């Protein structure tokens, strides 16, 4: 059972083309400010793949740092994303883009980030006592006034029924207080925390929001397959739903031709679970391997909207076609359903929050009810 | 993280999406999970 960072080292060094890209993707980052520092501006930018591997190995036993406590004014788009911070500028280079599109690279990244996920759901923090996972969160600043208020404010911004305290909003273990970071046993439990009962009431409407999320795109009359790589990223159902690799989804692609795609963004300080947008019977469910740090040329150096200081933020439509993601298709033409045909739900990973966890209530053949929790993003691959 | 919801052509004729979702440039906050996204009109 080899260290997945060591497997990645060997992949890079035992393949001449990946060896070349692993240098060039750093050489192509400008030396001049602001790129001498990573996008948080708090540390020097990494300039070679060996320091990158060293840091990746170190991160396997670290939780993300809440660096806004002692530095409230630096860019905050990569809160929660220590791997993303290291490769953000490389992601924006031509060689970096080619590197992070490579399937072998992304298998290695998957295994690295899944190994990280093991630590993030470990309540001992890899053998540092029964309260280690909790203490690591406190050490990382997550119980500071600044972090807690940011989480409280972010939850309140979407509702008129506002709460004063974190414990009135989110479920956490017994005797949780701010000082003990609500007795969350590990990062994963804090990350996938649930709302308290009644804090997110299920509306009467036929479709409700699946995620606590910020609207991004609403496209009508979408195509079977499209040039999703051109400026504006027209949606390509065939690629997004994985008909490239699963002939079973092709009929649903055809059934969505002419339909509409709505896309919304989940911030790091937002609720990360998934709720059923409609009532119906699950007729298709998949997971799709893909990229983690692939962003558009437009989001890179010299690009018309680049370099993204928090890639793939400005490439969200693009990555729906290539990133690690999942597909759920619900039939609402059933008893108790709203009779609006087939509804698709496509959670799409971004960077090291790319673990798509379908709950067992979403197995094909089962019926989900509007508002039920049906899955969650996790930090991981 | 991000996610998509996908609706069929004949269903979209029957639905009224809330403005914050259909016209994303107007949105200034998260939408609340479980809250209304679209309602039937016929
Ligand atoms: N959708 C999860 C949050 C992703 C935040 N952006 C980023 N890591 N670049």
From TrEMBL, chain A:
Gene Ontology process terms (BP): phosphatidylethanolamine biosynthetic process
Domain L-tryptophan decarboxylase PsiD-like: 3-128
GO molecular function: phosphatidylserine decarboxylase activity
Cellular component aspect of the GO annotation: mitochondrion
Domain of life, per lineage: Eukaryota
Keyword Acetylation applies: no
Keyword field: Decarboxylase, Lyase
Protein name stated in the entry: DNA, SC102
Originating organism: Aspergillus oryzae (strain ATCC 42149 / RIB 40)
Taxonomy of the source species: Eukaryota, Fungi, Dikarya, Ascomycota, Pezizomycotina
